[PDB]
From a paper:
Olfactomedins comprise a large protein family (PFAM: PF02191) with seven phylogenetic branches. These multidomain proteins contain a ~30 kDa olfactomedin (OLF) domain and are predominantly expressed extracellularly in a variety of tissues of multicellular organisms, particularly in vertebrates as well as selected invertebrates. Here we present biophysical, biochemical, and structural characterization of the OLF domain of a second glio-OLF, that from M. musculus (94% identical to R. norvegicus), and H. sapiens noelin/pancortin/olfm1/hOlfA (npoh-OLF), which are both neuronal OLFs, but from different phylogenetic subfamilies. The OLF domain propeller blades are arranged radially around a central hydrophilic cavity.
Gliomedin, also called collomin, collmin, and CRG-L2, is involved in the development of the peripheral nervous system and is phylogenetically most similar to invertebrate OLFs. Human and mouse glio-OLF lack these corresponding Cys residues, and the disulfide bond is replaced with a cation-π interaction involving Arg 476, at an equivalent position to Cys 409 in npoh-OLF, and Phe 541, located within the C-terminal loop immediately after strand E-21. By contrast, key amino acids present in the expected metal binding region in glio-OLF render it unable to form a coordination sphere for Ca2+. In both mouse and rat glio-OLF structures, an apparent Na+ ion is coordinated by Asn 423, Asn 471, Ala 472, Leu 517, and a water molecule. In our structure, this ion assignment was made based on lack of stabilization by Ca2+, Mg2+, or K+ in solution, unresponsiveness to Quin-2, fit of electron density, and refined metal-ligand distances consistent with Na+. In glio-OLF, analogous residues to the Trp/Tyr pair are Asn 417/Asp 486, which are hydrogen bonded; this cross-loop interaction is further stabilized by hydrogen bonding between Asn 417 and the main chain carbonyl oxygen of Thr 484 on loop D-16/D-17. Thus, the available glio-OLF structures appear to be in a closed conformation that prevents access to the central cavity. Comparison of hydrophobic interactions among glio-OLF, npoh-OLF, and myoc-OLF reveals at least 20 more hydrophobic interactions for glio-OLF.
Numbering used by the authors: 299 to 542
The structure:
């Protein structure tokens, strides 16, 4: 099924950090924790035990095995998925463990400011939804096309590279819900492109995302509550979504 509209947002918090990510578990689990990264690069993640903890800036610091770049990470099943800064390596870091798993996206743009999403200086966007685990990236072959790697969860390996043919120059940002890729306009306020990942075909999508045009750092669908999570100019937002 497809998204027909996005509701008014709920703001959870405003921080000084213009760019960052906030993330919650999306696996069918009782887990109230929140994970945050700040800025476009670093080696630390802040873990909050719950929302009141986030509200009061009471966090545990977790040191990562590799520096992250960008704002396109995701948390799924007690693991952080993220772009290893300055490489085409994607890292899966399980929070109670030492050695992460890694995979390489050999034909993906990953340096020299040739971003997948320029607004957020992002090269890769990891997304988790009802139909699988996905890595959105931009081709280093033609330097333009948006692709989505479909993952195998157990092996943390790529089973398929899906070419949308959509040029990244038209994309503001994106998220994936129920196996459908949704891409925003360059102003990041409307969704103007969509792609049925398992059907391998474009589908019509034109609906408003938000009224604010403030810079958009992170945009991510969480299948556990079916809400859009975003980070907008230091504002942590939640959007409800309406399916057809
Ligand atoms: Na996104």
């Amino acid at each position: 099924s497809m998204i027909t509209s996005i509701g008014n947002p709920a703001q959870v918090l405003k921080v000084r950090e213009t760019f960052g990510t906030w993330m919650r578990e999306s696996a069918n689990k009782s887990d109230d924790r929140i994970w945050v990264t700040e800025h476009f690069s670093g080696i630390m993640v802040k873990e909050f035990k719950d929302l009141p903890a986030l509200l009061n800036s009471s966090f545990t610091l977790l040191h990562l095995p590799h520096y992250f770049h960008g704002c396109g990470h995701a948390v799924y099943n007690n693991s952080l998925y993220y772009h290893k800064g300055g490489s085409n390596t994607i890292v899966r870091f399980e929070f109670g463990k030492e050695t992460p798993q890694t995979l390489k996206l050999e034909n993906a743009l990953y340096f020299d400011r040739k971003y997948l999403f320029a607004n957020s200086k992002t090269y890769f966007n990891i997304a988790v939804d009802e139909k699988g685990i996905w890595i959105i990236y931009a081709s280093s072959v033609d330097g333009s096309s948006i692709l989505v790697a479909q993952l195998d969860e157990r092996t943390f390996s790529v089973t398929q590279h899906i070419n949308t043919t959509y040029p990244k120059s038209k994309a503001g940002n994106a998220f994936i819900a129920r196996g459908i890729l949704y891409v925003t306009d360059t102003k990041d306020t409307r969704v103007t492109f969509a792609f049925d990942l398992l059907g391998g075909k474009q589908i019509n999508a034109n609906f408003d995302f938000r009224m604010s045009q403030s810079v958009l750092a992170m945009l991510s669908y969480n299948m556990r509550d079916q809400h859009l999570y975003s980070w907008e100019d230091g504002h942590l937002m939640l959007y409800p979504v309406q399916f057809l």
